[PDB]
Structure 1
């Protein structure tokens, strides 16, 4: 019957969702089609114009080497959005599947998967990412995606298991098995639509956190290489002119802050819509 229609109508009048969705659409279009906004190469550096004020020929200015900051802050958006999305798109699948399995089939699966997620929760994301990217001499985008996905799943798996085993209590799965349905078809047909809630609500926040941690990883020198333009590595080199008096620092940092805030408030709105009950203990 299309449940999500009434949820759309309920959260469609909320400005906190509307502005978030508009910002997300804008960010996705900037990340997908960069050449529509700019017309110049991000890497071209004309040294004869080193530090120019923002004028009709450069809407954001020009940094020490000669690049213009507009293209350098557009293509960085491209790279950062790619890295952030490719990792949550896999964390969702893996964590959700594992939490659904261990949490609907009871023990002999729950024990193993709970011990595994307990092992993987005993080591944080930033520390493990730093340690593993240390000995990764050849680093690129897909390696950062894989290393983020390898350590970002446990919380999603925990939330999915908690949301599924609670669904297994309500006795419509019981009425379904009382008329003949092997546990897998029951799992899919009934448990998945009624439990893909909080998993998305947390996947959005996980995407935001992935963007943040990839930025702060690339700032420490161990992250995306220098051959790709990115906030962090751009901020890392723009932070040195502030003492002399150039506010070049704020365009990449401002873009990054807006990008993260969009996904954070979108996740908050989606939590408020899909699952406003478990807001007294998880957070």
Structure 2
């Protein structure tokens, strides 16, 4: 009766997994956008008087070594991680989708070179390549991290988009359309973008959580974000010594880190099971 963009909403509106993931994602987005709303304290204030205080009404999440209560420190880190993930995912979606489409639809002398390029970029495990490249940078800011991540994140989305478009190209409506005009580009847009825009959305909303995890574990080692930006995985690095003594300070930032990734993964799962169930048996 209406575009597939409207009946799918109703078909998913009654999905507990989806509604839970959406609520959690909205909460994460609003806390990352407007940090200063929840409390008014400042995260970089360092009082050496209190150093290992316990949770209380005054300081909810106790205090760290130098006095920073973990509560305010566990918000701007969310802001940083979320903006990293979102920017990288948007860029990688655009680039990978565009290249995979232009490769799968045309064929000779283009899909060949694109396959060569994505195969070359496929031999590099993301973590190792990022580690090697982040050794030569002195201007370490958030933007360079987003750049280096998107530089290596695309091959998978490229492969998925290429497969999807190469499959859709083997239909008959795409032929009947060109049988009456619509030179090879306008037809490409009008008929191959909508009927295949699904799989790329699924792989992108999973690669989002992938990138978030990668950024966290990379900033943990100390070759990631600088110390100027409060961030999970770097609030953990300075808390690994006191963990072996039996004080669970480390688990509060990690507790927030292990939740956003979950909210993204179990949302990508719902979107995939709703829009492209077929490719579950031999992929993922």
TM-score class, shorter: over 0.9
Shift of the alpha carbon at 1:48?
A: 1.4
Larger mean Cα displacement after TM superposition, 125-134 or 236-245: 236-245
CA distances 1:135-191 after superposition (whole Å, capped 9, x unpaired): 112211010000000000000000001001111111111111111111111111110
Shift of 1:244: 2.6
- 3-state DSSP of counterpart to 1:174: helix
Query: Please, which runs of 5 or more residues in structure 2 have no aligned partner?
Result: none
| Mapped contact 1:204–1:263 kept (Cα < 8 A) | yes
TM-score, normalization by structure 1: 0.98
CA drift at 1:279: 0.4
Tell me if structure 2 keeps the 8 A contact 1:139–1:225: yes
Q: 1:259 & 1:51 partners in 2: Cα distance?
A: 27
SS at match of 1:248: coil
Contact 1:38 1:70 in 2 (8 A): no
Query: How far did 1:19 drift?
Result: 0.6
Q: CA deviation at 1:59?
A: 1.7
DSSP-derived class of the 1:153 partner: helix
Q: Are the aligned partners of 1:50 and 1:62 in contact in 2 as well (CA < 8 Å)?
A: yes
Partner in structure 2 of residue 145 of structure 1 = 146
Within 2, Cα distance between the matches of 1:159 and 1:208? 17
CA distance in 2, matches of 1:125, 1:242: 29
Cα distance per residue 1:5-41 (max 9 Å; x no partner): 1111111111111111111000000100001112111
Q: Provide TM-score, normalisation by structure 2.
A: 0.98
Equivalent residues in 2 for 1:39-118, closer than 5 Å: 39-118=40-119
Question: What whole-Å deviation, never above 9, does each CA across 1:61-86 have from its counterpart, x for those lacking one?
Answer: 11110001111001100000011111
Instruction: After TM superposition, give the deviation of residue 102 of structure 1 in Å.
Output: 0.3
**Following the alignment from structure 1 to structure 2, what is the Cα–Cα distance between the partners of residues 190 and 8?**
22
Matches of 1:164 and 1:107, distance apart in 2 = 14
Q: Residues 176 and 186 of structure 1 are in contact (CA less than 8 Å); yes or no, is this contact kept in structure 2? A: yes
Which deviates further from its counterpart, 189-198 or 41-50?
A: 41-50
Shift of 1:245: 2.5
Structure 1 contact 208–263 (Cα < 8 Å) conserved: yes
Deviates more, 1:66-75 or 1:236-245: 236-245
Counterpart CA distance in 2 for 1:251 and 1:12 is 33
What is the CA–CA distance in structure 2 between the aligned matches of 1:39 and 1:133, rounded to whole Å?
Answer: 35
Alpha-carbon deviation of 1:247? Answer: 1.2
Q: What is the Cα deviation at residue 209 of structure 1? A: 0.5
Which consecutive unaligned segments of at least 5 residues does structure 1 have?
none
CA distance in 2 between counterparts of 1:189 and 1:106 reads 19
Determine helix, strand or coil for the equivalent of 1:230: coil
Counterpart-to-counterpart distance in 2, 1:61 and 1:264:
30
Aligned to 1:266: 267
Mean Cα deviation higher: 155-164 or 39-48:
39-48
Distance in 2 of aligned mates of 1:151 and 1:119:
11
1:242 positional shift: 1.8
